[PDB]
């Protein structure tokens, strides 16, 4: 994972019932950006025609 600077306090109801409030600097630095790779296939067969 990543090392995060965290404070323990309520913030205007945005961490109510296990919610998490995240800074925009975390997004701007691509600290939790992931890469996903997908495969597609095309099959050419033989027919009677």
């Amino acid at each position: 994972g990543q090392n995060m600077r965290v404070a323990f306090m309520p913030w205007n109801g945005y961490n109510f019932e296990d919610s998490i409030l995240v800074s925009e600097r975390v997004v701007q630095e691509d600290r939790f950006t992931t890469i996903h790779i997908q495969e597609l296939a095309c099959v050419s067969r033989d027919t009677k025609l």
Partner: protein
């Protein structure tokens, strides 16, 4: 909207060790068998009509 139609081959031809091997398609070769249960009562002790049948 459609789908192509296929034909199941009767004879298979391939190239193994530089030689052309030819065989029959084992998935489509017809075959039969003899029912042993009915044929195992062919004994003279039974009826003659049954025996000839």
């Amino acid at each position: 909207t459609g789908e192509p139609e296929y034909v199941i081959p009767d004879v298979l031809v391939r190239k193994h060790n530089g030689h052309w091997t030819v065989e029959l398609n084992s998935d489509s070769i017809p075959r039969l068998q003899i029912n042993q249960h009915y044929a195992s009562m062919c004994n003279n002790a039974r009826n003659d009509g049954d025996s000839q049948f």
